[PDB]
Amino acid sequence: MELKDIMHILEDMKVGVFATLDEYGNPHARHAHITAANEEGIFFMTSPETHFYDQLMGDQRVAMTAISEEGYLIQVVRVEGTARPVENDYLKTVFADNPYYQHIYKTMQVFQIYAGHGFYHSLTQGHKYIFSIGEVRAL
């Protein structure tokens, strides 16, 4: 199993809980849509003038957990890493002309978890994988 596949699974989860820090280091956590997820990282959006946006802009550190009980599997992904805002200039090199992903080009602001380490767990099958972003190991 490889990262392309883990990230495809994550992308299909559609939604994750993202934990970020304010200027006092206090934790905050909310659901956000996973716009895309692949070998390059995890992409999501938020709006300027939201606290999620402020927090990410003030401190790149992020943790995310996502879970799917879609189909007959129960799948959990946990990631800890760093997020940055990204513009179309960068997105084009990742998504290019692919029609499934044209919506990502700009209102909203896209961010990317560009570096980190993660854990993928299929609970019903007892399969655990650890991986990095920005290198997958079956435990």
State the residues that interact with its own copies by CB under 8 A. Answer: 17, 19-21, 25-31, 61-65, 67, 76, 78, 80
When binding is defined by CB under 5 A, the residue of 4, 8, 14, 30 that contacts Cl ion is 30
CB of 127 to its own copies, least distance (A): 17
Between the CA of residue 107 and those of 46, 50, 76, 122, what are the distances in Å? Answer: 9, 12, 31, 36
- How many chain residues touch Cl ion (CB under 5 A)? 4
Q: Is 95 exposed, middle or buried (0-12, 13-18, 19+ CB in 10 A)?
A: buried
User: CB-wise, 3 or 63, nearer to its own copies?
Assistant: 63
Indicate the residue among 1 and 17 with the shorter CB distance to Cl ion.
17
The smaller minimum CB distance to Cl ion, of residues 65 and 122, is found at 65
Which partner in Cl ion, its own copies, none is near 91 (CB below 5 to 8 A by kind)?
Answer: none
Q: Are 44 and 32 in contact (CB under 8 A)?
A: yes
Cβ atoms of residues 116 and 134 within 8 Å: yes
Give SS3 for 9: helix
